[PDB]
Amino acid sequence: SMNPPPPETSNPNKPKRQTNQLQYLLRVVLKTLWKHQFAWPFQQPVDAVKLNLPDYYKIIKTPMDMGTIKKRLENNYYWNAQECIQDFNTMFTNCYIYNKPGDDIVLMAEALEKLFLQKINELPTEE
Numbered sequence: 001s002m003n004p005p006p007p008e009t010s011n012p013n014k015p016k017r018q019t020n021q022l023q024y025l026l027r028v029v030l031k032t033l034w035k036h037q038f039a040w041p042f043q044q045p046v047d048a049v050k051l052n053l054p055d056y057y058k059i060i061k062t063p064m065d066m067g068t069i070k071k072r073l074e075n076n077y078y079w080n081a082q083e084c085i086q087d088f089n090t091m092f093t094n095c096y097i098y099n100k101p102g103d104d105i106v107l108m109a110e111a112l113e114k115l116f117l118q119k120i121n122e123l124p125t126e127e
């Protein structure tokens, strides 16, 4: 019923790059999803205490959210675009794993995921 530590957003010994694909993930992908009317539940880690979801972290063992993604991108946490893509996909998947079809939160995730897919379809070739 308690919250875990959040995911890492800083690790000085993890090697880092700033690639055109990662820049796109920040300037296009994250910015597009973040501004969306359905972004708010996904803008920070799930607070299973305040939301009274005492089983959330019993079920979701790889938590991820756009707050975490945003910090990762802004602090050049990643080596490659696939790492970041995997974070978005983890976020969507968790939502679908925890919730039931047609729950509001699932429709919200689906709307963001549609946009995500459209933006990833035009990830630029590496420079």
Ligand SMILES: CC(=O)Nc1cccc(-c2cc(C)[n+]([O-])c3ccccc23)c1
Pocket: 040, 041, 042, 044, 045, 046, 047, 048, 051, 053, 094, 095, 098, 099, 105
């Ligand atoms: C800090 C925090 O947890 N905010 C928040 C606000 C509203 C909804 C959610 C939320 C977010 C997510 C990802 N899921 O799956 C939920 C499931 C059931 C109830 C609520 C949620 C999170």
